[PDB]
Structure formats: C-alpha cells, structure tokens
Amino acid sequence: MTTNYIFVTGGVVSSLGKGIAAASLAAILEARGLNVTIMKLDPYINVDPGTMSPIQHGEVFVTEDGAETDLDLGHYERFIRTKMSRRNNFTTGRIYSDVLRKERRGDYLGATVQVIPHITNAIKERVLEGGEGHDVVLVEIGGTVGDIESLPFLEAIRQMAVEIGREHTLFMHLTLVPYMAASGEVKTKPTQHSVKELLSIGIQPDILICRSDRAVPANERAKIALFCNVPEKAVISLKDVDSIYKIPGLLKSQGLDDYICKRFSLNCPEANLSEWEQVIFEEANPVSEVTIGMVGKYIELPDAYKSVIEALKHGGLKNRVSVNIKLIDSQDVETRGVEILKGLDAILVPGGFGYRGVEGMITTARFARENNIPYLGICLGMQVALIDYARHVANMENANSTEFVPDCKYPVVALITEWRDENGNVEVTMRLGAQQCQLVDDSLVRQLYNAPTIVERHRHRYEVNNMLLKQIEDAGLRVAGRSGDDQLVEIIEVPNHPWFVACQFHPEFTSTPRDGHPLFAGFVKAASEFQKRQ
Amino acid sequence: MTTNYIFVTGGVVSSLGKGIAAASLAAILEARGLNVTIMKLDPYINVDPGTMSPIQHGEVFVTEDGAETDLDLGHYERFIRTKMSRRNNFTTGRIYSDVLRKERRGDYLGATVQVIPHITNAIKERVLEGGEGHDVVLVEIGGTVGDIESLPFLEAIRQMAVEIGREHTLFMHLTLVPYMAASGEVKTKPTQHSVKELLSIGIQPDILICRSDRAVPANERAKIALFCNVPEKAVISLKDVDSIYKIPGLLKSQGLDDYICKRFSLNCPEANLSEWEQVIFEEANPVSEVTIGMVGKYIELPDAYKSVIEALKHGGLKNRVSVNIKLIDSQDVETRGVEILKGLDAILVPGGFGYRGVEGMITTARFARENNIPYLGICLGMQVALIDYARHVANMENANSTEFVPDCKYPVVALITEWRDENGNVEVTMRLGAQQCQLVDDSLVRQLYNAPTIVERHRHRYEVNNMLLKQIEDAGLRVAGRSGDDQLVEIIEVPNHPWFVACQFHPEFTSTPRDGHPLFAGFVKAASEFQKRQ
Amino acid sequence: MTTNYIFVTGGVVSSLGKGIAAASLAAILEARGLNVTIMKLDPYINVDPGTMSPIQHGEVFVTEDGAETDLDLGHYERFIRTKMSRRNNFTTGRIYSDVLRKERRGDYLGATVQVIPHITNAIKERVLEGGEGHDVVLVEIGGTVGDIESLPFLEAIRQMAVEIGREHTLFMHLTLVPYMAASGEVKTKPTQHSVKELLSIGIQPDILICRSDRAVPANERAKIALFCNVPEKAVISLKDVDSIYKIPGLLKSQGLDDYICKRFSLNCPEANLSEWEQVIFEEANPVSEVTIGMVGKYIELPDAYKSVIEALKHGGLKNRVSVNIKLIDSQDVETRGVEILKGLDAILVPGGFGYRGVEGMITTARFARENNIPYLGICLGMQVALIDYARHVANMENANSTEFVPDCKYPVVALITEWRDENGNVEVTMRLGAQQCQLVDDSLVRQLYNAPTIVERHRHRYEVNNMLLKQIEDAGLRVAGRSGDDQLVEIIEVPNHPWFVACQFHPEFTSTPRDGHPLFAGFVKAASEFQKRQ
Numbered sequence A, B, C: 001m002t003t004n005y006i007f008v009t010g011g012v013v014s015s016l017g018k019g020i021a022a023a024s025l026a027a028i029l030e031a032r033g034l035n036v037t038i039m040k041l042d043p044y045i046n047v048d049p050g051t052m053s054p055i056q057h058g059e060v061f062v063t064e065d066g067a068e069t070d071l072d073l074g075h076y077e078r079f080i081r082t083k084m085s086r087r088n089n090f091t092t093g094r095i096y097s098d099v100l101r102k103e104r105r106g107d108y109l110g111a112t113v114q115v116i117p118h119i120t121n122a123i124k125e126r127v128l129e130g131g132e133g134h135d136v137v138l139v140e141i142g143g144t145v146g147d148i149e150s151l152p153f154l155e156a157i158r159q160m161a162v163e164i165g166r167e168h169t170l171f172m173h174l175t176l177v178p179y180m181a182a183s184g185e186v187k188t189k190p191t192q193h194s195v196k197e198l199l200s201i202g203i204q205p206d207i208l209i210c211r212s213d214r215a216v217p218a219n220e221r222a223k224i225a226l227f228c229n230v231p232e233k234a235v236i237s238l239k240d241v242d243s244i245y246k247i248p249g250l251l252k253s254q255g256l257d258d259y260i261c262k263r264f265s266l267n268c269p270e271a272n273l274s275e276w277e278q279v280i281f282e283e284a285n286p287v288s289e290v291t292i293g294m295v296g297k298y299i300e301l302p303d304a305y306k307s308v309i310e311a312l313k314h315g316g317l318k319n320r321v322s323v324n325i326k327l328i329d330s331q332d333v334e335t336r337g338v339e340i341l342k343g344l345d346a347i348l349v350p351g352g353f354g355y356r357g358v359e360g361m362i363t364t365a366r367f368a369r370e371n372n373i374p375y376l377g378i379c380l381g382m383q384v385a386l387i388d389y390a391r392h393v394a395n396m397e398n399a400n401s402t403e404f405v406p407d408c409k410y411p412v413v414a415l416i417t418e419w420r421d422e423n424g425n426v427e428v429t430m431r432l433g434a435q436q437c438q439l440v441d442d443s444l445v446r447q448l449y450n451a452p453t454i455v456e457r458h459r460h461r462y463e464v465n466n467m468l469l470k471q472i473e474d475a476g477l478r479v480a481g482r483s484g485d486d487q488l489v490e491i492i493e494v495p496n497h498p499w500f501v502a503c504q505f506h507p508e509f510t511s512t513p514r515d516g517h518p519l520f521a522g523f524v525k526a527a528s529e530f531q532k533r534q
C-alpha cells in the first residue's frame, strides 16, 4: 500500500510538547499493528547537534547507527519500537550543506539554485528517504508556524501533500488554548490566528491538537472547527497531564487514530494500549520513595540529562518506587564540600565534556564509594570513578584524564593514540552508536543484564588507559565489561560496595517506560534497599 | 438535487471584467440545459445604487421588479435568459440596514450583534434566498481580495462552503497576470500573492481565471497550479478579447464547464454555443458602417451609458451595421454649437438628471429634427425632444421641465402633482421597473415592436404634462405610446421625419446581443438608410 | 496646545484587562495635572448596549447624560474624575447607522459610500468630537487585532496618526506573554505575531504592555523590543496583580507616563499617586470581615454586577471591612428556600429585568426584613422589597409588578400610564441618567448623603404605583426619597430594622474607590455591626 504522511506543525508558541504528542500518536498507531516511523525536521543551521552545548539545546541523542540527533528522537524511541537512524532527523544546515556541495561541483548544470525548488526538493527527498516502506510516517516540523526558519519545511510539505495527494497526507497542527483567570474561559483566538498563518503559507490543517492547562470544552472546540475549516471530531483537546504516558490514551478516547485510519483507508484492529495502562498504573502507585542525586555540570538545564532523568523514572516503574531526582551542581561539591551529598539514597554522575566541575564529580564518586551509597557513573561518571579509585585506593596521586590535564603522570583515561604509562612509555577515533560489549561472568552487571553480550550506545573519545589498568585492578577495582579487538574497558565495578557500576556507553538511550533497563532497574532497587537501612 | 454554488472572487486589481467572465460561464452552463442564476454582492454602504451618480460605478441597472442594481446585472441579463430581480444584487449597506433594524427592535434577544455570526448569517440567508431552486448559482463577490470592505462576504461564503459541503461549492478566483516588456515574460507573482491572501482568509480557490493582454502559456499555468494548490486543468487563461461574445467559447475550449460539471456531479450534454458563434459571426461580418452621436452629460465615464452603448451594438448585429459610437458632451453643444454634431448618421440622447448640459440636448434634438437626422431619445432624451418641439414648433417660449425651472410658464415636463397649464390652472412618485405600455395604431414603434402592448422598464418621476400636451399635439407631435389609467405619455414621434422616436422607459435594459431590440434595430437601420442618402 | 491621542489596542486574546490598563494610565496622567479623557470604540453592531442582556459583555453602564454604554466607562469613571458621556463610547452599529441615514437622505451627493473613507471618516469625527479640548485622549479599540470587526477602527486611527502627526499620536498595544510550565519560561512569540498583525494593517506600535501571570523579565522585554521595532523602555510589563489599584504605580515605576510626556513634549510634574497608595493601604489593612450575599438572576456572569461588586469593595475601604461577596442565584431561593441565605452579614438585591428569579428575590427581601439582616435593594431590589412589604405586612395578596403579572389586583410597581388601584380605578417612558432626588427629613439616607437633594443615575421604566403607595405607607413603609413633579418614589426604608434601604437609581455608577459612596459605606458598616452582634 502507498505510504501515508502526517505532517505535525506547532502554532502560537514552542514548548507545546509536540514531540511527545507525535510520539504518543505513533504509539497508538503502532498499538494497531501499523508499521509507523517519526522524523524530526529541525530549523537550526547546525549540520547536526554534534557541536551544540547541552546547556543550550539539551542532550545530544545518539541513534544505533551513530547519528547525533535532537533529544526528540529519544521521545520517539521511548514511545515506539521502530529504531531511529540518521534518516529520522535532519536540520536546515544539513539541507543547505548538501545543496551548496552539489552546487559548487556542478550537479545543477549552471541552473540558478533557489529555496524553491532546490531547497524544498532536498527536504522532500530526505522526507521520502526516511518515510517510504512504512504505513504511516509522522513528520514533526520544528519551529513555530509564522517564523522565517520553518518556511522552507512548510513549503516542502505543502508540495508533498499536492504531489502524493490528500488521500495519503494529513496536516496536524498543535496550538495553545490559554485559560484566562480574569474571565474564567479558555481562548480560541490564538488557535484561529495560528491556522490563518498556516493557511497564508498554503496549508489547510486537517487536525487541530489544542494544548491547554485543562480540557478544551465542546463549545470552544466547535468554535475552533467553525473558524479553521476543520470538522469538530478533528479538534482534539490535549490538557497538561501529570504523566506523558497517559497522552496515547487521551488521544485514542477522542478518536484521533480512528479519524487518521479512516482518512488513510486503513482497516486495522482497535489500539491495544495495555502496556501504557500498565506504565500509568506503576507510576501512580509507588510503594516506596527515594532521593537520587544527579551530580553533573549541565544542571542549569535539566533537558541536558533528559534520557538519564527518564531512565531513572523507568527504574522507579519496574521497582514501583517514586524517584525524587535532586540535580546537584558538581562545582558546588568543589566549593561547599560533600556536605550537599548528605540525605541521598543513591548518586548518579551522567555524561559530560570539559574539566569544569570534574574535580567535584571525582569527590562525589569517592564519597559514594567510602559511605557505601549506590553509584551509577555514565561515560564521564565512569572516568571520575576510575580516577577516584586510582587516585585514592591504588595511590596514583593526581591521576586524571588527558582531556583535563594532558601531561599528568598517571593518565588513567586518555585517547588510544595518547596511551602511556607513569614513565611515559607507549605500545607498538570518536566512538558513536551501537557497539557489542562482552560482560564478565561473576560481575553484578552480567547478573542485571542476564546475558553474556549487550549492545549499548557510545558518544566518547577518551578511553580507559589499558597500560595503567592492571595497577588499578590489583588495587581491587573489577573490569565488568570490555568490547572489540583493542579490549577497551566498557564497565567497571567496586566490590566491597552494595551497588557501584560505571560504564562508558549511554544506557539511558535504550531505556523505555515499557521494557525498562536492567542497570537503572538494579540502581533504583539498590537506592530503595539503601533508603531502608537508615 | 442540491443547489451548487460557484463563488467568484477577484484579486490583484479591480476592472478584471469579473461580471462578464461570470456571465460567460453562466452562458456555457445555460447552453448545457442547466438552471443557472448569478448574483452580485457589492461591498459599498449604499443600501442600493438609487442615490449613486452614474459618474461613480456606472449606470443604475433596473430589474423588472423595479430594483435599482449594479450594472453587472445588465451583463448577466445579456448572457443568460434568467430575469434578474432584487434577490440577484445586494450591498453591505443592505445587510447592515437589515441587521441594525432587527437589532434595534429586539429580534436578537439581548445578544451582542457581531460581524460574525450576525452579518455573515444575513449574507448567507440572502445568497440562499437568491440561489436555492437553481442547479448552479454564480455568486460574484465585488471588491478585491485583500481589501477590508469584502471580508464579511468572504467570511460568509467560507462558512457556506463548509456548511453546504465541497461537493456543492467551488471557489473561482480571477487574477491579473501582467506582461512585462523589459523581460518579454508574463508574471505569476501577483496571482501567487492574491491566492495566499485568499487562503489567509480561509478560502482555497478551486479554479483560477488568469486575466492577461495575451494567452497565459502552459509553463506559467503549471507554475500557478504548483504554488496555489490548484490542479493544472483548473488554471484557465482569459486574454483581453476583441469581443466579449467569444469568452464563453474560450472558457469552454479550456474545459472550465467540464471541470465544474465533474466537481458538481452533473450529467448534462456538451454546451451548444451556436447562439454565441452566430453573434460573433454577425459582429465580424458587417456590410456597412454608421457613426451614431450619443449626446449626454456623463460621457466622462462611458459605463454611465453601458446598456445604451451595448443596445446600439445589438442594433448593429441585427442590421449587419458596424456602429461607431461618438460620445459627445452636451455642454460642448451649449458652448461650441451644433458644429460638433456634423458627420453623424444618427443622434441618441440617453437618460440623466439635473439641468447641467440639458440646454445642449434640447439644441441637439432641434438639430436632429430640422436636418432630418435619425433621433432616439431615452427618458431625458424624450423630455428634451418634447421641450425642443414645444419651444420651436408649438411656440411655447422657455418651455421646460419643473426639475430644471420649477416656475416656468410652460412646464411641459413635471411631477403629476405639479401639473399646471400656462395660466397656472391645475387638475381637480417614482416609476421603477416593468410597466405595460399601449402603442398607438399608426405609429413607427407599433410596427417595430409588432404588438399593441409592450413591457419596458422605467426609472423617472418627471412625466409629460397632459395639461400642455393637447397644444403640442395640434402643432404636429404624435403620442406613439401611453400607460396606466393616468394615460401617461411613454413614446412620442415627429412624423415629418425619417426616424424620430423618444420614450420615457429605458429600452436598453431589455436589449440582448442574441434577441436584439426592435427599437434599436430600427434606429440603427434608419442611421444606415441616412448614411446611404449622403 | 494640540490634543494628543493614545490609541490602545489588544492582541493575542481578549480579557487582557485593556480598559483597567487604559484607566490606570489615565489615572497617572491625571495625577500629573493633565486634562485627560478616555473613550471606548466597541466593534459590535448594536447601536448601543441598551438592547443587550447583561449575561453577554456584562452590566450596562449609564452616564450622567443617560447614555447606555460598555461597562469599561465604569472602569474609566472609577480611575479618573472626568465624567463620561455619550461622546466617550460608540459602536460599529452607531457609525453604520449614522452613515446609512446620511446616505439614504442623500448627504454623500451621489458618491459610492465605502468603508474607506466614509466609515473611517465617521469614526475619526467621533474620536475628534470626544477628544479635542483635552491634553491627552486615550482611545481604547475593542476586539483583538487580527479580527475583522476591529479593522475599520484600526484603519481610522492609522489615518488619524498620519493626519494629526506622530508628535501628537502614540499606538499602545497590549499582548499576552504566556508562562509555559513544561519549559518554566515566558513566551514572546504571541507578542511578535500580534505586532506583525498590527503592522500588516499599517500600525507600528510605539509602546507594548505585556500581560503575564508574573513580571516579564528584562531579556524577554529586550527580545520583544528587538522583533517589534519598539524601544526597550517602551516594553512595559503588567503582571496579574492582587489589586487593580496597584496598576498605576507599576506603570509609573516602569516610566510609561515619562515616555508618553516625552513623546508628546508635555512639561508636567512627577505623578503624585498618594490617593492610589491610600486606597491600596486601606484595602491591605482591614480590621474586620463581613460576608454580603448578592441575590440576583445574572450571577452566572459576575460582570453583570461589575459596578455593584466594586461599590461593595469601596464601602469596605471606607469602613476597613474586608467584604466577602457570595453570588447567590435567586432561582435557588425559589427551589431550596432561605436555607442558602444563612451565614450572611448583609443581603444585596441588584437590578434586573424579566420575571425569572424575581419570586426568589421577594423571598430574600422578606428573609432580610424578618431576621433584621441589613438589606440594600437596587432598582429591581427595591421593586421586590416593595412587593415583599405589600404582600406580607400591608396584606395585599399576590402584589406584583405589571412587568411580570400585567393584570394582578395590586400592581404596586407599574408604568405611570398603567397606574391603577385594587378596583381598577386610574388617575385623570424610560428614565435614563442623572436625576435630582429629594430626601425626606427623618430618613436613614438623608443622614448618609448629608444633603436634602442628591443626583443619582436611573435605568428603568417601571415606577412605584402612587395609587397603592398610601396603603403600604400606613402599614409602616417609609418613603425616604422622591423626584420630579410626578413625586415618583426613589428610596424606601423599613424603619423597624437596623439597615433596610432600597432605591430606584443605580448608586453603584457614582461609587469610586477614592471618594467611596455614602449609601454603600453605610450598608457595609451595618453589615459589620450585624456581624459583631452574632
């Protein structure tokens, strides 16, 4: 059958939760047995988020194929089982970069290269490339309708709708319906003006998703329908929910998936949301409560640790525990000491780059190791764990990473090419995406993962220095996992500790609310067990 | 069968010939056996054009039922055989007048009366009133898309399309496609911008009629289709033709009627445009040529005499005479004398109000009478013919109308209530629309109309003074027609003349290019006869 | 000195509190010694709100000259000491009514009457009429920028700005800046889009007043300035304050009046807001608390009783009583009985029309009288108080108003022309605006107003029947006030009661927060006295 496209646009404001809304709709369609994918079109000129600061954009999501993408693809993978790739995320920058390259080498045969049709054609090609061979493709258009940055995307999808036909294309538009205290009424005017803006660029929306702090009553939905040339049943209320896992249910209860399947002439069974009903239940009914400190350098923006914060919450779902995440500035541990780590049932040190706040994270890994507080180190969290141990147990004074102190005596962490020992002797690449890791037979990790070989995702350059490893191993530290021919250290553990695991890979990118994650399941359990020994 | 609506809008500029294009489309649909009507929605505040001077938006057209309307209804009646009434023309003024009246007396029951829905409801009610009981209703929206004055009409028809459904409603949009000499190319940008403007108001055009001084090539039509979400075959070219009677053929040859009948699911035969082909043939194959002088006070805007000019052309068709119409200012006859009436094969004095330029018309009527030049007087053209004959034959010094000189000794023209004689002795209201007129047995008009009674349309309050008539009759003037129990003089003749006729009514409003008009056929024949004699 | 105009527009949503913001700005300019006025341009088709039910856009405000106006004029009179008249409020309906009347009788001399210039000219003439002879005129444009209904007003004021010049005209634009919980950020996008919409109509705002549930931070204000061609200091924040009396101070503290006086070249002293500081102080420092029950038929929209609710708050200010207003449906008293009138320190029955809920108010007046609960009746609240006393004390079975029961034996309230007695014997028009009322020597109101004559504002046609009055007077009811040569009953009192007063007029329309109102000051004092006694 012909591939169907749902173009999802945002009006009035950004921060409507358009990613989660699109992911939720994809979840309902997947729950119908449909082959569904989602792609994010980002209006930024960055060729990809690889260069971007976590504090500004939020976390860099890493796909299996090793693409650095918008954190929204994390939302997508946590709602549908289709694996994201490079084909599921592209930016204005990628499109202009491609068109400029083709132009400079002469692929347009001396033609004038214009936003229309050359930029729009490049956009359409990447949308077809990522979509074709699926039943339904959700295409999330970043930016707000009315802004300059999204116009080429909006013109591209307008052209696609006409070419492919309106039997296989829907326009879905999210708007804000603000509630005013003074009048006690919700306002449809912003939605009306947003739809006019969308029409002015040549797009008639087929479905309106109205975001408000409460449900949009029938009267206001009827007003929106009348003013926006949209049938009443295609005006969906999506209130501020206490849990995003409810959103698939709320959309189904309003017939959104029925309307879509009718429009695309899909005969498929009723959506089975039983896994989501289970997730909703687990989250609403925690038996215990835990305070887990996340000690890092990007806590200025929580979205910097989006997938880590979500992976913890998923650990809470599997153990029926309410995880209170305390975001602690690692630089505050340097200034004010381990005083601010007191009253934590567990400690997590997530990913990061740069020396700023790293000495605070080293101190944190020590305090966790010495006081038997459950610890999970991710990438940089493993680096500071190996440094702490080598520095304070194996007695390798000032042991550090070459990333932070290039010419230190004991570079316990360094690039493969920088690998040297304490005397400066030597022997004789960025790691991105899914890599097979070999677990050790007696390790806490091999128990939790319940398998010999795991696949987790890397985004790191600096590796555990194999030339200084044996000296750290003999001082008590255990290597729980390794990968490849170079036998690179993937996971370390501290025996004589209730729960101490640090890994190079980013386990948070494979964690889902439905299937959870072994490491975070274990980690939150250990946090619970620790909390009821006080 | 549900009534189908075609909403005709104009963009870029006014003066696109939107009325003639709508009329021409109606003529194709009429030629398919469809029950078709047209209505004009005028954005002006005047309750009707009754108060408006003809130097503004042109002549005041009068319908059978006595409605004063836009001259566009003249175009409608000349292209389809459906008779126009008050239901076929209304203004913003009419809508506001009706809604304000209803509001003031309390019909809206304490509701806030708003443009939406109260003004838009009133507009839709009048469109449904004028339209329902027809197969296809063409609704011409006056003004230009993007202007404030038309927005209530556009919002009204947007709501109609949604309510009635898109199976029974089409949006047809006329645009300008200018030719630029500099690039020798035709420009689609105005059409693109006009369609965006129409979309921003919530209307997707289904058909684009592109007006240019030449045919719009296939590539530019394909470009318009691409940018305007309109199928390529729904992009119609309409060049500036030498004859408006060719337009129905040009629209048919591009499949406009085929597209409309498909969208509306109408099983009707192919259009037989034989009647229009015949008119085109007649017009292109004249045998002789005449110059007819039209002497009036509104010549500065020819559309002041739209129906009269067209009626003269129809007379030409019926005699195979090419009519050269010379518009002559009656005020120039007051200054420069009868010198400017030389080289005329016939003289027409059309309708008008106010004394300005009337003495020039009286002189013109005298000149036509004394030099045996064929003369047709319409309304004022009859008044000045009666005045001429009263002064210069019946020897009534300064004989005039009370409209111009209230207290003259010989008010040969006056209101029925003002009727007096030369000594001021008396006997013991506006006429609008179709009135029966009794024709006199041995009269020129009796043999032209070939019937004892005729129906013609009036717009005048100033009648022939019956108290001074008997004196003018004895002096040689023949009453050729009377009407009503008041035996009001409708037609006069000077029988010592080849062709001298003047009527109170506006015969030009019943003249069509297909069926012609007896009076004008005779006038142009007399002009041809006069031309031959020189 | 040339009169200066500040055009106040709203974008994004209605219910921005635009009237109170304009009034507050007027109050700052008043406190600088400037001769300031405000006018409201309402986009509704109603010629005036006289026909409108109070459940629509709220209470019908009445001016001294007897004009029925938008309740915004209530806000204006409560913030400046300039008296509002018919010149301070007009609707689209009024403009169209005037232009249609002029057009129909022929004032436009055969011209085509268009929205531009004829409607826009009529609007500008009324703005100049209401404004000229003042230093600064605030012109509040009703509706929201982007809507059809306001476009004639916006085009009118655009033309005014150009004609008068930008040395004497400012555009002030109110927008919503929503807070999003998801991102914990404030959103400028709606303001950006609203300013673009205003610019697309040809208006560059000079000042932006940003409405949010909190202060708009400096960075977001700088962003708004950047995108909207507006200086940073002309971007004013206005949070949702706990008291509207603080708004003048907040606008002054951001230099709004300084910017306005600079742009208009006005040498006037710094604003002394001592009167507003005093009101704020009074409001924030109550000594006691009372619950006053307001029993009416319009409680579903509180703004139906805007001026009454405000008048009760002003009474509270003058007694340092915090007034808890309980809105009670009079229909609930008809069903559930006087049970719901328990725990009330005083009862107010405000104005209204129609029989619906009146029997509940009669019961309420009885309950207040018999249980010695302080009672204020306004217009209908007086009618039901007279009816109560006629039935239950003067023993007149089913005594009523002719408005509700036309043919009752005892029409104690009726039109002057309907006045009859119990046996149907007779004696041998709308009251609007300020009328003098004579107060009786030994009356409660005579001592509250401390004057023999008072000026109060009327809106009623149904008077006290003087033919049945003498019977009710003998039964104990005291006439406290009369007016005119017809000695119509204006105020009644039950003198066997701590505080029972009811007036025909609307005292709430002359009550201000600064100068209070004698009647309401007394009512709230009586409520305080009653509260203490329990």
Ligand SMILES: Nc1ccn([C@@H]2O[C@H](COP(=O)(O)OP(=O)(O)OP(=O)(O)O)[C@@H](O)[C@@H]2F)c(=O)n1
Pocket: A186, A187, A188, A189, A190, B114, B115, B116, B117, C013, C014, C015, C143, C144, C146, C147, C148, C149, C150
């Ligand atoms: N294109 C449009 C749309 C609307 N209007 C007008 O709008 C006014 C209602 O004024 P409102 O502030 O209450 O706006 P509303 O439509 O109710 O939406 P909201 O309140 O839920 O935000 C009403 O006279 C009219 F419909 C308009 O003029 N042109």
Ligand SMILES: Nc1ccn([C@@H]2O[C@H](COP(=O)(O)OP(=O)(O)OP(=O)(O)O)[C@@H](O)[C@@H]2F)c(=O)n1
Pocket: A114, A115, A116, A117, B186, B187, B188, B189, B190, B220
């Ligand atoms: N919404 C739009 C539409 C078009 N464009 C651009 O427009 C440029 C061609 O500029 P042109 O003056 O030649 O305009 P064109 O479209 O050929 O119509 P025409 O009047 O010439 O017949 C071309 O780089 C690109 F298509 C645009 O930016 N945004």
Ligand SMILES: Nc1ccn([C@@H]2O[C@H](COP(=O)(O)OP(=O)(O)OP(=O)(O)O)[C@@H](O)[C@@H]2F)c(=O)n1
Pocket: A013, A014, A015, A143, A144, A146, A147, A148, A149, A150, C186, C187, C188, C189, C190, C220
């Ligand atoms: N005419 C405009 C204005 C802006 N843009 C773009 O807008 C994007 C930021 O998108 P945002 O949702 O964050 O909007 P922002 O401007 O911050 O206001 P706010 O509501 O968040 O307070 C940013 O890449 C770029 F500025 C645009 O394309 N064309």
Ligand code: NA
Pocket: A185, C014
């Ligand atoms: Na509203």
Ligand code: NA
Pocket: none
């Ligand atoms: Na071109």
Ligand code: NA
Pocket: none
């Ligand atoms: Na932002």
